[PDB]
Amino acid sequence: TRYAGKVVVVTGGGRGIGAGIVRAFVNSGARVVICDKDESGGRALEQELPGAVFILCDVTQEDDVKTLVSETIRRFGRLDCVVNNAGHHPPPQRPEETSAQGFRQLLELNLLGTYTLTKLALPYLRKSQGNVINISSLVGAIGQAQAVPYVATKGAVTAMTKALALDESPYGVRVNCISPGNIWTPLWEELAALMPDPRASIREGMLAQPLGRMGQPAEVGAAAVFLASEANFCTGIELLVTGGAELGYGCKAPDI
Amino acid sequence: TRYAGKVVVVTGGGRGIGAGIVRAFVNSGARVVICDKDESGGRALEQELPGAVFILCDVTQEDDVKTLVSETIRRFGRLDCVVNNAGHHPPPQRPEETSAQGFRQLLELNLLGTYTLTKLALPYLRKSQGNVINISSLVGAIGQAQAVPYVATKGAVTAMTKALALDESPYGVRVNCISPGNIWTPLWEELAALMPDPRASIREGMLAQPLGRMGQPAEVGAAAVFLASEANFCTGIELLVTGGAELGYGCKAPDI
Amino acid sequence: TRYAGKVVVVTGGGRGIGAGIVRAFVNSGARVVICDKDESGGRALEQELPGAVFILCDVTQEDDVKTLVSETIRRFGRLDCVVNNAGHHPPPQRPEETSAQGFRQLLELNLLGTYTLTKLALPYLRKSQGNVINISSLVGAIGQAQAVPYVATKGAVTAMTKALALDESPYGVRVNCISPGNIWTPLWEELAALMPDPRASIREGMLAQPLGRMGQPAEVGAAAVFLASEANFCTGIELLVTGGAELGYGCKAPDI
Amino acid sequence: TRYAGKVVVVTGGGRGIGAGIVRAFVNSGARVVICDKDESGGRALEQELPGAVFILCDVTQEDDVKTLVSETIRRFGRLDCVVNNAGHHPPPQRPEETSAQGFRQLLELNLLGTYTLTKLALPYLRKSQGNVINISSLVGAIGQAQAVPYVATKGAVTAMTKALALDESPYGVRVNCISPGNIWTPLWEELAALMPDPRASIREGMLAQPLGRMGQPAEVGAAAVFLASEANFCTGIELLVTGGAELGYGCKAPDI
Ligand SMILES: NC(=O)c1ccc[n+]([C@@H]2O[C@H](COP(=O)([O-])OP(=O)(O)OC[C@H]3O[C@@H](n4cnc5c(N)ncnc54)[C@H](O)[C@@H]3O)[C@@H](O)[C@H]2O)c1
Ligand SMILES: NC(=O)c1ccc[n+]([C@@H]2O[C@H](COP(=O)([O-])OP(=O)(O)OC[C@H]3O[C@@H](n4cnc5c(N)ncnc54)[C@H](O)[C@@H]3O)[C@@H](O)[C@H]2O)c1
Ligand SMILES: NC(=O)c1ccc[n+]([C@@H]2O[C@H](COP(=O)([O-])OP(=O)(O)OC[C@H]3O[C@@H](n4cnc5c(N)ncnc54)[C@H](O)[C@@H]3O)[C@@H](O)[C@H]2O)c1
Ligand SMILES: NC(=O)c1ccc[n+]([C@@H]2O[C@H](COP(=O)([O-])OP(=O)(O)OC[C@H]3O[C@@H](n4cnc5c(N)ncnc54)[C@H](O)[C@@H]3O)[C@@H](O)[C@H]2O)c1
Ligand SMILES: OC[C@H]1O[C@@H](O)[C@H](O)[C@@H](O)[C@@H]1O
Ligand SMILES: OC[C@H]1O[C@@H](O)[C@H](O)[C@@H](O)[C@@H]1O
Ligand SMILES: OC[C@H]1O[C@@H](O)[C@H](O)[C@@H](O)[C@@H]1O
Ligand SMILES: OC[C@H]1O[C@@H](O)[C@H](O)[C@@H](O)[C@@H]1O
Ligand SMILES: O=[N+]([O-])c1ccc(F)c(O)c1
Ligand SMILES: O=[N+]([O-])c1ccc(F)c(O)c1
Ligand SMILES: O=[N+]([O-])c1ccc(F)c(O)c1
Ligand SMILES: O=[N+]([O-])c1ccc(F)c(O)c1
Ligand code: NA
Ligand code: NA
Ligand code: NA
Ligand code: NA
Incomplete structure (x- = not known):
């Protein structure tokens, strides 16, 4: 009942992190609209979950x-x-x-799609004193190798979250983001399958976290339900869900 | 039932943020030990709350x-x-x-007391795969005027949280901190009462946040219950509970 | 002679911060190519400065x-x-x-123009073990009101700087950014002239810094010459040139 | 001549980073007072350098x-x-x-010694519109393993730098810090010599940076001379001299 009577839209909710967020909000008592460009996962999720x-x-x-x-x-x-x-x-x-x-196309999905839905939703969020949660990435903050366009799009999302939080604060609408690190999802699995040694790629991704494992969609989902339902004094924050990957020294490559 | 069957110690739990955290954990189903150097508030809280x-x-x-x-x-x-x-x-x-x-004395409370309890508790937290939550402050991150020793102690707490998170990660023990901004507590009220114009001091503190109000102990408490009970992939994070005070430009004081 | 014998390209170098950077590099002994879409300022700068x-x-x-x-x-x-x-x-x-x-158009200038020049220049920067300096903004990091697209573009630039620094590090090419705060430039003056009270707008901008003034193009220029000529162990950094605007509490708008 | 006619005090200036800073300021034209608790290195440096x-x-x-x-x-x-x-x-x-x-003793050196000299120097820095540069560490920001007290002291220094910058800004005195990462110094060499495999420890430290090497005292020195002599709009900043160690994912240790 933490978010009972509330209505939530989750984009890309058919699989992966998005589906974990859908499940978390349904478990909290909300009705959830699953948005996805692919029918397969999202349609099955609707059949599975009464509140979705x-x-x-x-x-x-x-x-x-x-x-x-x-x-x-x-x-x-x-x-x-x-x-x-x-x-x-x-x-x-x-x-x-x-x-x-290719950079323009990735900006269209990762940044402008977030912008467009947020813009169209804000009149209704103002009426409900609702909130916006953007899924960014830790690599927007710390960078990543061989991903200049992707990193740039997530740096934009995290910054945009703070700008929008300032603009919407007088209307009581909070705007926050979650920055996941390595989360085990179909995208992660697809990307590892392209590598010379997929198993080595996955083990490397697991050991990038001090916790020694990747995260779960359910863990991102719990962070989202927190931001929506119980974080009434949080706006413009970047909630790290990363297993500590940003902490300490690691292998990134005597004084010349 | 989010944290049912669990045992929580809250230091300085007799009033203010600490009491808000005590209440949040009791409401989650935990048993809470209220630690405080003053008997008045904490003893009344024990009488009031069955699980404390x-x-x-x-x-x-x-x-x-x-x-x-x-x-x-x-x-x-x-x-x-x-x-x-x-x-x-x-x-x-x-x-x-x-x-x-005076700096040494403030380090003794704000930093070394946190260090000492954490050290003595860690053997038991390892057995329970428990977690540590340190209450730092936004001003450790961004600074504050007329508070050099206080700011230094909270910079130390936030950094120490990250170091300890790295050390305890192989044992499954998470270590996180919450950095509140202006929270309306008896300490805030006491400090404002020392000012020439207490009402003006309080209004200034309210307007330091884009949300236009100060935060509540219950809001810090909800963040703590989240970190304890539902943030299993978060360690070494600094959870801002600040109403957006760190966002955007403000009055802090053409090019000479 | 700090950067003698070196060749520097400065985009938007005809006025404002860009011209201050041009002047700083000429004073360091470099030859400078002033790039600008407007002829007026840049052509006069070429006549004025022998090394440009x-x-x-x-x-x-x-x-x-x-x-x-x-x-x-x-x-x-x-x-x-x-x-x-x-x-x-x-x-x-x-x-x-x-x-x-409009968001797409601003991305084209603020982000993709930086991307395109950097890409075309990198083969030559690799030969010279040269470096890239992107001019981002403090508001990419902390947000700004009534500037969602602008803030998003600068969040992207700062993040992209870190990604590129990782990619180019094995080739000895450093990639850094400078994030200015309020710098007194023709753009600042133009924007203030649109306000109801331009003088009040300028005074507010001055007091947004603890130093109580805005910055100068020459100060951004000195930071750029440092990053190019003397920061050989800096890559992927965000050098703040802000007069302390990000520090402490300010006016951004008791607990409800 | 960048800092000619100026007088600089460098604590711990007898070897390592401190000696690199001493040399950088002498090369800039300043007179330097080398402070150290050990006579060996500092006395030889005085004999070597006319301006020290x-x-x-x-x-x-x-x-x-x-x-x-x-x-x-x-x-x-x-x-x-x-x-x-x-x-x-x-x-x-x-x-x-x-x-x-042991924590108290490390606070005494790393934090309170910085506090005490700064306090005693500020009346004179106000007269000269001088500046303070604190040498913190990247691990104050991101944490380090097996170093809880050290990390806490540097988190305190970085935070204290921001608080002091706010307090001294109305007097024109800037307060900044440098956060080095792995710099090859006698302390680094001493610490590696305690390890089971010193050569492996040193190689690991080199590869913690995307640049694939550790930094030099001269590089920290150049950053200090920049902050003193050419960073007139910088106060309260944390200048990273780390070779990019904080960037990207690394080895810090599929979803359970
Ligand atoms: N997996 C990770 O480690 C990780 C880490 C940090 C951030 N993220 C972010 O989390 C989000 C989800 O990632 P994931 O790993 O779950 O990916 P995924 O590929 O497993 O799932 C993404 C979902 O979004 C849908 N989608 C894609 N383009 C869409 C569009 N134009 N319109 C509507 N739906 C669309 C897909 O069909 C899919 O159902 C992304 O924003 C990603 O950048 C992921
Ligand atoms: N109030 C704010 O705006 C704010 C903002 C950021 C951080 N904080 C932090 O939150 C925490 C609580 O602040 P608050 O405003 O609730 O303060 P408060 O003064 O209202 O309550 C603090 C409680 O701690 C107890 N305490 C003090 N010293 C103790 C000791 N040596 N041993 C045991 N108990 C002790 C007090 O008796 C009191 O019950 C502090 O760590 C403070 O730095 C507060
Ligand atoms: N002024 C500030 O307070 C401030 C603060 C933070 C960041 N910045 C950034 O600093 C940079 C310079 O800002 P400014 O205040 O000096 O601006 P400005 O308007 O005074 O000068 C910008 C210059 O860039 C040129 N330019 C614009 N579009 C161009 C294009 N497509 N191709 C080539 N040249 C082009 C203009 O003709 C002009 O000469 C910008 O990236 C801005 O976002 C400025
Ligand atoms: N070496 C690194 O990788 C590294 C990284 C980040 C930060 N740092 C910091 O840089 C600073 C210098 O480190 P280093 O590697 O050059 O160390 P170092 O041991 O090589 O040199 C430190 C110098 O300070 C002197 N000193 C120590 N205690 C003193 C005291 N009480 N009074 C006066 N002088 C004293 C020593 O005698 C020595 O000459 C320290 O603050 C350290 O924490 C070093
Ligand atoms: O495909 C990799 C993982 O993706 C997650 O979204 C699913 O919940 C898991 O069942 C699966 O193991
Ligand atoms: O004393 C100021 C405030 O302190 C908080 O801890 C209490 O919950 C409030 O009742 C009170 O208004
Ligand atoms: O136009 C406002 C300011 O812009 C700067 O670029 C110039 O150097 C100044 O001469 C001018 O005062
Ligand atoms: O001792 C390791 C290193 O310490 C530095 O301070 C010195 O400048 C070097 O000569 C030496 O290689
Ligand atoms: O940190 N990320 O944003 C990230 C990491 C790994 C992935 F496979 C991914 O799709 C996204
Ligand atoms: O941000 N703080 O840590 C903070 C702010 C105001 C207070 F009254 C206080 O006691 C603590
Ligand atoms: O912080 N900025 O990016 C910024 C501030 C003020 C301006 F007038 C401007 O053109 C840019
Ligand atoms: O990052 N540091 O503060 C640090 C790293 C390595 C050392 F040997 C050292 O003495 C200090
Ligand atoms: Na359904
Ligand atoms: Na009780
Ligand atoms: Na010329
Ligand atoms: Na001498």
Whole structure:
């Protein structure tokens, strides 16, 4: 009952972190709209979870997003929280292997889709004194190798979260982000499968955390439910869900 | 039931933020040991809350703290979480008005008391795969005027939290801190009463946050219960509970 | 002679911070290519400074940038440092007053122009073991009101700086950024002139810093010359040139 | 001539980073007072460098420090910059192997010695509009394993730098810190010699940086001369001299 009577939209909620967030909010008592560009996972999740429904929506298509918001209000009568989770990490790319156009396309998903849904949702979030939760990444803060466009998009999301928090504070609408580190998801598994030694790639990812394991979608979901339901004095924060990967010295490569 | 069956020690739990944390953990189903050097508030809290008991303990006295831990284990059989909240903010002091000995005394409360309880508790936290929550302050991160010793003690607590998180990660013990901003507590009220215009001092403190109000002990308490019960992939983090005070430009004082 | 024999490109170098950086590098002994989309300031700077030449170049036009790099190599035989300073801050815009297309256009200047020049310059910077300096902004780190797109672009630049630093570290090429706060420039003056009370707007900007004044282009220039010439163990850093604006509590707007 | 006519005190200046800072300031044209508790290195440095003199001074002894300041003024007539570099890193210590009294002793050197010299110097720095530079450490910011007391002392120094910057800003006195990462110094070499495999310990320290090497005292010295002589709009900053050790993922230890 922590978030009972509330209505939540989760983008990219059909699998991975997004599905973990969907499950966490349903378990808290909320009704959840699962937005995803792929039907497979999200439609099955709707059948599985009574408090969840699936709406096909590509967050890069402004008309898809307009319909997502108007259908949410038409079907459920209010909107309390938007979780902007949809996003993609390309395979490793050296800087000279990137393109401006590929950079533009990744900005369209990771940044502008978050911007567009947030903009269309804010009039309703103001009425409900709701909140926005953006899923950024630890690598926006500390960088990552072979990922210049991806890192840039998440640096933008984290910064945008703080700007929006300032703008919406007089209306009682909080805007926060979660920065996960290595979370074991289908995207992580897909990316490891492209590596010469997938098992070695996965073990390296596990040992990047002092805790010695990757995180779970359910753990990101619990952080999201906290930010929505119990963090009434938090706005503009970056909640790290990383297992301590940012702590201490590690292998990143006597004084010349 | 979020933290049912667990045993929590809260230092400085007799009033203010500490009492808000005590209440939050009792509401989550935990048994709570209220530690405080003053009997008045903590003893009344024990009478009020069934899941809470009061143990008189000055965290600067190592033998008081040894007895706090051994009495907790004797009476409740386990220890799952230590919340190091005891601490003090002196009245405003210009740098030339501080002393090394006053600095040493503030380090004894704000830093070494946290260190001592954590050290004595860790053998039991390892057995329970428990966790440590230190109450630091936003001003450890961003500074504050007329508070050189206080700011230094909280910078130490936040850093120490990260070091300890690294050391205890192989044992499954998480170590995190909460950095509150302006929280309306008896200490805040006492400090404002020393000012020429207390009402103006309080209004200034309220407007230091984009949210336009100070925070509540219950809001710090909810963050603590989150870190203890649902943040299993968080260690070494600094959870800001500040109402956005660190965001954007403000009045802190054309190019010469 | 701190940077004698070296060749530096400064984008947006015709006025403001960029011109201050141009002057600082000329004073250090470097030859400087002034890139700007406007002829007026940059052409006069070339006439004024013996070690500087002006090349008309719009950093959003990839063919302009290709020609900028090839002309620099043709005329001076090497390239040691690229300072990505070109960028724009729109007038204050409430979130609901922004557009995706306006956001895209600002990303094109503030982020992708920096990306494009850096990409085209890196083969030559590798040969010279040169370095990249991006001019970001403090508001990428802490947020700003009525500037969601601008803040997002600078969050991206700061993050991208760290990603690129990781990628180029094995080649000995350092990548750093400077985050200025309020610097008194023609852009600042233009923006204040749009306000109801320009003088009040300027005084507010001055008092946003504990130092009680805004910064100078020459001060950003000195930081850039430091990063280029004497910071051989710095890569991926964010050098704050802000007068302390990020420090302490301020006016950003008792516990409800 | 960048800092000609100025007078600088460097504590712990007899070897290591401190000696590199002494050399950098002498090369900039300043007169330097070398403070150290050991005579060997500092006395030889005075003989070697015309613009430098050695004063025996233990920064934990308040009367030593009073005499250091009064002798500096008596001999040179002004004081422009204090570099608080004296400090120590103990050998690796597990948390349960530390003591409160050992923690107190390390606070006395790393934190209170910096506090005491700064306090005694500030009246003269106000007259000269001088500045303070504290040598902290990257591990104050990100933590380190087996170093709870050391990490806590450097977290305190970095925070104290920001508090003091706020307090002294109305007097035109800037207060900044440098946070080095792995710098190859006699302390680093001594600590590695205690390890089972010193060569393996040194190689691990080198590879903790994306640049693949440790830093040099001269590189910390150049950062200090920058902060003193050319960073007039920087106060309360933490200048990282770390070779990028804080960037990206590394080895710090699939989802359980
Ligand atoms: N997995 C990690 O380690 C990790 C770490 C940090 C941040 N993140 C972020 O978390 C989020 C989710 O990552 P994940 O690992 O769960 O990925 P994932 O690929 O497993 O799942 C992403 C989901 O989003 C959907 N999606 C993609 N593009 C979409 C679009 N245009 N419109 C609507 N839905 C779309 C996909 O169909 C999928 O269901 C992303 O923003 C990612 O950047 C992930
Ligand atoms: N109030 C704020 O705005 C604020 C902001 C940031 C951080 N904090 C921190 O939160 C904590 C609590 O602050 P507060 O405002 O609730 O203060 P408070 O003075 O209202 O309550 C502190 C409690 O700790 C107890 N205590 C003090 N010294 C003790 C000792 N030696 N041993 C045991 N108990 C002791 C006091 O008796 C009291 O019950 C402190 O660590 C403080 O630095 C407060
Ligand atoms: N002024 C401040 O307070 C401040 C603070 C933080 C960051 N910054 C950043 O510093 C940089 C310079 O700011 P400023 O105040 O000097 O601005 P400015 O407007 O005074 O000068 C910017 C210069 O860049 C040029 N320019 C603009 N678009 C260009 C393009 N497409 N191609 C080439 N040149 C182009 C302009 O013609 C001008 O000469 C920007 O990146 C800005 O975001 C400024
Ligand atoms: N070496 C590194 O990798 C590294 C990294 C980050 C920070 N630091 C910091 O840099 C500073 C210097 O470190 P280092 O590696 O050069 O150490 P070092 O041991 O090589 O040199 C320190 C110097 O300070 C002197 N000193 C020690 N205690 C003193 C006291 N009480 N009074 C006066 N002088 C005293 C010593 O005699 C010595 O000459 C310290 O503050 C250290 O914490 C070092
Ligand atoms: O595909 C890798 C992992 O992705 C997560 O989203 C799922 O919850 C797991 O079942 C799966 O092991
Ligand atoms: O004393 C100021 C405030 O302190 C808080 O700890 C209490 O919960 C409030 O009742 C009180 O208004
Ligand atoms: O236009 C405001 C300021 O802009 C700076 O770039 C110039 O150096 C100054 O001459 C001018 O006062
Ligand atoms: O002792 C290790 C290193 O310490 C530095 O301070 C010295 O400048 C070097 O000569 C030496 O290699
Ligand atoms: O830190 N990240 O953002 C991140 C890490 C690993 C992944 F596989 C991923 O898709 C995203
Ligand atoms: O930010 N703080 O740590 C803080 C702020 C105000 C107070 F009254 C106080 O006691 C502590
Ligand atoms: O912090 N900035 O990025 C910033 C501040 C003020 C300006 F006028 C400006 O053009 C940019
Ligand atoms: O990061 N440090 O503070 C640090 C690292 C290595 C050392 F040997 C040392 O004495 C200090
Ligand atoms: Na359903
Ligand atoms: Na009770
Ligand atoms: Na010229
Ligand atoms: Na000499």
